[PDB]
Every structure is written in C-alpha cells, then in structure tokens.
Design a protein around this nucleic acid. Sequence first.
RNA 1: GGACUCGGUGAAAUUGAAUUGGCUGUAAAGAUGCGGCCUACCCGUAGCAGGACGAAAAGACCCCGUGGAGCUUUACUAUA
RNA 2: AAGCGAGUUGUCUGGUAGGGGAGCGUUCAGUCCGCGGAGAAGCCAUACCGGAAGGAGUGGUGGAGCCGACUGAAGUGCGGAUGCCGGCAUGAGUAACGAUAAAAGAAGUGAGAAUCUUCUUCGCCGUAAGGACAAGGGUUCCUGGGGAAGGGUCGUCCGCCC
RNA 3: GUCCGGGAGUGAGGCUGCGAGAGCUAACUUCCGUAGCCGAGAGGGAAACAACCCAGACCAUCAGCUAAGGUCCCUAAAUGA
RNA 4: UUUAGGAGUGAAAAGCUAACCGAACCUGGAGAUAGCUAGUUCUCCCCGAAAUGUAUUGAGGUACAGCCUCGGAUGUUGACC
RNA 5: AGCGCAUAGUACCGUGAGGGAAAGGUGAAAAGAACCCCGGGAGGGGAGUGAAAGAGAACCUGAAACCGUGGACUUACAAGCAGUCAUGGCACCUUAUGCGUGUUAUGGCGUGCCUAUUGAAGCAUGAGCCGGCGACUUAGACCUGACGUGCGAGCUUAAGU
Lengths: 130, 113, 143, 46, 58
Amino acid sequence: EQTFRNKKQRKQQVKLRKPGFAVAKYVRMSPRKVRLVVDVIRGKSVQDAEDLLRFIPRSASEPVAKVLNSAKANALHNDEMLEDRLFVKEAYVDAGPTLKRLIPRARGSANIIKKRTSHITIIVAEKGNK
Amino acid sequence: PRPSAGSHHNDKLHFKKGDTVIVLSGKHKGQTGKVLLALPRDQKVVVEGVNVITKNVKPSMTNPQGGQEQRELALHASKVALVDPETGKATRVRKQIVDGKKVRVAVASGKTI
Amino acid sequence: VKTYIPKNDEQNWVVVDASGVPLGRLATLIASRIRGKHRPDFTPNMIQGDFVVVINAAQVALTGKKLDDKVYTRYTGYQGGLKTETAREALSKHPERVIEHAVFGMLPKGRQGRAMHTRLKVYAGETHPHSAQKPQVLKTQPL
Amino acid sequence: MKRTYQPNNRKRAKTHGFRARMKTKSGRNILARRRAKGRHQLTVSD
Amino acid sequence: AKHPVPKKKTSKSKRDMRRSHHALTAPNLTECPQCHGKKLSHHICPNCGYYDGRQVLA
RNA sequence: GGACUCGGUGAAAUUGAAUUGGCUGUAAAGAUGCGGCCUACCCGUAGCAGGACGAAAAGACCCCGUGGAGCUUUACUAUA
RNA sequence: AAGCGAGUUGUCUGGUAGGGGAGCGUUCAGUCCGCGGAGAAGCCAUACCGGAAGGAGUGGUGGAGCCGACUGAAGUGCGGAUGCCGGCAUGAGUAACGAUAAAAGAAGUGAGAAUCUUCUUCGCCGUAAGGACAAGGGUUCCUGGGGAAGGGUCGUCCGCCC
RNA sequence: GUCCGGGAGUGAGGCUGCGAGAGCUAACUUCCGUAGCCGAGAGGGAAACAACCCAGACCAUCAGCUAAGGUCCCUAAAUGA
RNA sequence: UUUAGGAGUGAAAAGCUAACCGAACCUGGAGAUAGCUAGUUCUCCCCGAAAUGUAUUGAGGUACAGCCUCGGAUGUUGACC
RNA sequence: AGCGCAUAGUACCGUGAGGGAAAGGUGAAAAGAACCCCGGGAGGGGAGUGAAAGAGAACCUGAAACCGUGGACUUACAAGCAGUCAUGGCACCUUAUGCGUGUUAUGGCGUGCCUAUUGAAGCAUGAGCCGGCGACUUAGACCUGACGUGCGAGCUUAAGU
C-alpha cells in the first residue's frame, strides 16, 4: 500500500539516490573469477572477510577488497547503515567495456583475442538482523 | 549541448528591453515578468520566477561563497505577455510611421508603448 | 486405493531352507517373495523385497547326465580366450559363487534386481556364523 | 631482401603523378575517371 | 597442421562438479601465541611479533 | 629448459546434443543411447593413444559433366 | 439481404510432386463518433475459447499514442541457406611471457615496492647487438608531468597522453 | 461403361511368392513380368529390426472381445487332462 | 631504368611479372551459365504415383501415355457370378 | 534498415590503379551537479538539482544462449543423448470441498531435427547461440482457364480539350 496512482511521482518526488553502491567497474579479471573471492565471504565484513581476502597468498585484495569497502567510504555518512551492522545479501557480476588490441600469433588467417573485463558490484544497503 | 533553450518556438516574438508583464504556464503564476535583454536566435530567460539553488565552489579565485540565486534553467516566453491590463487582444499592429525598430501602436485595446 | 512404499517398515520375510536342493522350483522359487509373495501391498515400480535368508544348499547338484555343463560365459567383448565355461564339478571350488546367480532371469529390468543383490550374499555353511545377519529365523519348510 | 616495391616514386609524378595524363591524352579521361566520372575524391593526393 | 578440432563442447551439466576436488582448503585454525591474532602455519605475528619471545616489530 | 606451488594475460581450427562402460549380436552388417547380459562410490588433475568412421578444402587419383584453361598433330577451319 | 443442416449410412482413409478450401497478424490505405493518464502502445507471467496458428483474464513496467470491423495493397512469418556481420562463446585457466646472452643489495620515492633512481661488486657483445652517412618512419630528444588503454604481469619508466 | 481440359511426379528402387536368363540353380548381383509390401501410416508375433501370420485407425474413457502370439518367472495368460 | 600481359625474363622448369600465372592485378563486359547442388519462411480440411514403353550425340537429363485432383459428361454401355 | 556518407567513404587494404568501415537517439531543458569518506585515480556516499534521474555526464523501454546468488524439493550406488505418462516423494492450500499448484527415486520402454536420400534412428550430411536477410516474381492487349459483371450483334490505343 505504498504508491501506485500518479506516475509523474517516482520521477519527481523520491529523494535519495540508491543506497549502497561502490562498484568501480573494469575489475580486469573475468566475471568468473570475481565471484571466487566473494563466494567465500558469506559472513562478517572486513571482520572475517578481510584477512580471509586480505591475507591470502596471492593478489586479490587490492581493487577486490579495497573497493569492496569504498562502499563504506560512502557508507561513512553519505550512504545509510552502520558499522556494527552491515550485510550484503549475496553476489553477482557481468562484463563491460573492453578494447580491441591483439598481438598477431602465427598460422591460419588471423588471430582473434579479447582483453576481457568485468563489473565488480559492491553494495551494502537493505538489511535484516540488528 | 544541453537541449533546453526552446528555440523550437520560432524567432518572431517582438520583445526587447524594458517592459512589465505577468506569467502563466504553471509552476509560479505569482511572478511579474520584467526587465531583461532576451536572446534572439536561441533565447535564455529566467526572471525571478524559479528560485534555483546552484552552489559554485570556492577555489582561491575570488568566488569562495556559493550563491543560491540568479542562474540558468529554461522556459522561454509563452506565459503571459503584452497587455498593460492582463488578458485579451493581441498587439502586433504598427503605425504607418516606419521605424520598425520600435513601432508602437497595438490592437484596439492596445498600447502605444 | 493402490499401493504405498513402507520404505523399510512393513516386512515379514521367511527364512529360506536349503533343506535339500530341488530340480524345478530351485532357480524359480527365487521369486515367491521378492516379486510379491501373498503380496501385502506390493508397490510395483520401485524395488520391494525382503530378507531371503538363504542357507547351506551345498546340497545343490543340478541335473544328471547334463550336470557338468551350462551356459557359464563371462562377457568382456573378446572371444580369443575369455568366456571360461568351466563345467559344474570343475568350477567346483566355488558353488556358492554361482547357484544364487539363478535370479539372472528375474529382475524388472534396469535397476530393481540390480539392487536385490543383497538378500543373496553367499551362504553355504549350515547355520553357524549367523553373524552375517542375526534378525530372522522363521524357517517354514518348502513345498 | 628486395620486397616488391620500396620507396622513391618518380614514376608517379611525370608519368602517373597528378599532372601526367596529358602526355597521354586518352589518359586525361582516365585521370578524369574518378573525379568528373562518378563520386569520390582522388588517389594521388590521398 | 590441426589436430582434431573442438566440435563437441562442455558448457553446463559438467563445469559444475569441478569446484570441490580443490576449491580452497578452508582454514581458520589458530589465532596467535598470546596477543591479538595472526600466527599463520607456525609463524610469528607482526603485532607483538612473537611465538612466545622477542621478534619482529610493530 | 618445459610436465607440478603462485601473481596477470589465454586465442584460434571446430562444433546438434552427453546420466561419455563393455560384450556378443543386430542394423544400407565399423553400434557406446538398439537388442539380451554383466558391471562401477561420485569428482579433480598428471600422463597415454584404440576411440568418435580424428580435424582442414564438399578427393583436386578416377568416372560421370553435350565444364574451363593449357600444348601439340596434316584433327574441320580462319588467319598476319 | 453473402446459403445453411441436425435426424441417418457408407466414406470421414495416414499421406510424399499436386487438386478444391480456412485462416492468426503486422505494415499501407477508407470511414475515425474513436480506444488511453484510473495512462494504452514496449514488455513479463496466471488451468477461457479456438481445426492448428492463435484470440482471452491482470498486474508488472513503461512512456507517449494506438489500432478496429466491411476492404485492397506489402520485401506477410523456417532456429535452422556448413551463410554474412554484431555480440556472447567454449578449447580453460591449462601450452605459453619470446631466441636460457647470470645477478644480489644499500639507498631515493611513496600507495605498498622484485625488475626506476645515487651507486661497489657480475657477466654477454664489443668486425658488435658501437658512433656517423643511405631509405624509411615524421615526431623521435627534452622541461617534465596522470594510469583510462596500450608496452601479451603489472608497475610511481614510454619515445602513451599535455 | 462414358471423353476435353490448368496443372504432377521424377525415371535411377527392395523383398517373399511365380520361373527362367549370365550362374560351382550361388549372390538384400544382375533381366523380366505377375500380388503384396517399404519410396507415402503405428503394433502384437518376430529378442528390438521395410515386404512374414493377424490387423491399417475422427479426438477423447485406467469399458468388452476376437487373430497372431502365449498359458513358470524378469513384464499378461491352466507345469489342466 | 626501358622491357608488359597474351609480351618480356629466362641456366629450359613449361620456371616468373610483385607471396598460385597451364597466359598479372584492379575498374569495367554478364550473375560463365548451369539439366550440378544448399536452401527457397506461420498453422491446414477431403483425394493421390511412376525407376514400366516409345525418344534422344539420350541416359540418376528431359517428352509423353496408362498412372492424381477438379468443370462438363457418358439416361443403361459396368465389373462378379 | 536506406547509397557506402542522417556530418567518416577516419585510420586506411597496399605491390598498383583500386576495395572500405562500424557507428545514430538524455528529458521540452541539462539544470550534465557546491558540500565530509576508501582511494593514486578511475568508481562508489551524503543532498539539491531532477514534475518523473530503476534518463543518469559512452544516457529510452530493454526480451536472450553464455553468464550472478540463494532458496521450498530430490540426488552418487545409479547407469543411456532425450522422451511422455506412470504410485510415491518436499512444498501450496489467488474457492475444509482426502481436491491441486513448484516436482522426483524410479517404470514401458522408447534413438534426435533438418533434409540431396528406394533406402536408417544413425556414424549420411547441415547445425554453439542469439538478431535480420529468407527468392519463379515484377512491366509486358506475352496466352489458355474458375467466378462476378458488360453487353448478344461485342469490346477499344494514341492524349486533344
């Protein structure tokens, strides 16, 4: 029983923007491997999320986790929520703008590659428990 | 480009410098249109109609302040023009005295200035 | 009003005898239970059997003049030397490792009987080592 | 080694370079065979 | 020179049961000698920098 | 020095679709989804070739085609 | 006022080249009183009917129109033509980073620094992989500056970009 | 029983019966005609499987019987005389 | 730097003219035309086949006739007994 | 889509005359935006702007193979690309009405479509998918013929007004 009639509202009157949001795009590591460092953090943010992703014998915290809390930088007090709260329901990503580049190979007629890219997606808004 | 203007209104509206009018079209209806220079060939106009809010920064230039008054928007003419009174009777009629630069006499219920 | 699967609940099998092998209702009385003996509410489709408590049946002996002879085979796809058709009293080092393999004609095809291979489970020693399965000891002589 | 062409275009000046289709009158129309004949610019001044 | 091309593929169905025979070993075992909690597989802080005695530095 | 620990990049030839074991048989007879039977706890990666009638251009060896081109001979004949 | 059948008996067979025959609907056009702001047209889904194709009940969302019966017109309808482009692909994260002609580090910096910078130690060429003239690229060289992207890691280095 | 016409097809089949032809009466080789069959429709029997015994359908009913095939089981049906 | 296209070069291979010359490329003449062959789009109600003969520099090419549908028709002429 | 050009026949392909893209769209109007955060920045917060910012400073609505997660349910001891029904099995009950919605161990068994094929179900071939193009017609007294109509003594071209 929120709203329905008058469809010029939800166009004019609505305030806010979109609670959450932090996705820096690009990513540069396939919409298949993004999830690989998000499908482990099904709990406790930069609490038992960080070090779980900060300390992990490789390179996957820089622009993986450092952007994953860019939401918090906005959740500082530009975005809703708290500190001793926060959730992130699940996780999902996609592709994005690339750029034809290549570097010839050998045999055949022509070699055809793609630099490939993604879209990180980082949100912390509509919650549950308190 | 930022499509606003209202240059699809066609340049033949007569207006110049120095004049007292009212408004319509909505949003206000409480705003005595006046003064201004107008811009033939794409025209900008705001008058005290819409009270914008458009904070400029504050470098080290000279501006440091902000503002919140006097700034662009849209909506050209087409509101409530002419008539010292308020409504009815056009005005584009002109004395056989040449001087198109500012011909003065209007319709029946018209004014000569 | 149909059937229902108890999913192991309503069962009451009767311990086999091996009280003297026969020559006609041997490799076929393998049914008369597994498929539906008396049938309390035997639900077709999925499997449904009971503890065929087989016994010794070392008493086994086959037919007469055509004893040490049968379609033994092995199947592997090669005919050079496979398919050892070791006669009865030649393969006579097992005979508790075949025999039971007489239910190779009664399986609803597909899975089913490829699951009833539990009730079988060796057995040829004349009641002792009943540690294989303790539960039933219902007997009931065979007709 | 030698390719199939290499720089230095003298035979595309006073022969087949802009004004060298008068020496061959029926080449003038050939010069005019992609300017006053159909669309497009030319091919000697990019 | 080309050796039997791809032809048949392996999209879904499979390519699923392939994140289990490896995955990641799953950890969270120990939590440092005394103060706070780091430790690794037998290896001193950088916090207090120690397994039980003097080492590393804040 | 490559095959294995780790960070980034990762394409092409190709291709209906895989709960993709086998026999012996059957089928326009070279069957793994067919027959009848036996059989495996499911998955990952290293490595190997029997395997899909392996891949590529719809054999160009050949024949069919009142197809072409190419050379020769006193082939019918033009012709400097 | 454009032709239509129960009552019934055989046929109502299944049909590949085919004969007679009905339509669903989109675009163009007729008549537009029109249908839509509670908003239709764009689209996502719910067991009414239809010979099939399809027509139906409602929101969702979306933003300005849209189709109708009687009608004629139109490049009127395969996913499928080893087609063509545009995008997603999978071979799959393996093979591979390039001629296998050694490198460690102090320190500058700062966002952390292993490949920059001030530098002691090592080694490969040095009829060379030196420097000038020849063709070429035209912006290489600098005062230097920033990662979006490129240099097939990337980087605070470029002769990227100003 | 009875012709004129708008327009087909694509010409290169297979098998059992009927008999020969080339033929160690051999060949889902090859020639022929004559019923059927598959090129244009499914099954039981036949292990499943184009011509073989029975049978070619309007869509719907977990209603009946006939022929083949079967009357021990895996999946029907008297180890009845 | 002239030679060039149906010519030159040439150590003769029948090699090359610019990564294939059994006679260069590009704009142009026609799409070489095609009985070859891939295909030729939504959903249907009742009917229905030939690889037999004649023709062919003619054969899985094509023509026609028995062989299908439809308009008209054939007032006793049907096939079985 | 339409000429390739709705501001490009850019760069160019390159041995040479000679061959060339792909690509449009925010609302009327940008008002394309001051003000504290992680960060190098790109990218993301507050809040006005915005009638309407799930237009959104590579921008209408925005269906889809591939691709992103969870969940009500089943599943590794069960075997066939797939199938349809079949008793069960957890869920739901937009009408207690032992009646169904989202489904599956398993059973009968059962082999794909296109489509040049006598002929198969094939391993005979064509096919990873998405979006479109998707052809015997168009002018021609070229002609024959169904139906409706004009007439029985019948019907018209050239353009002149």
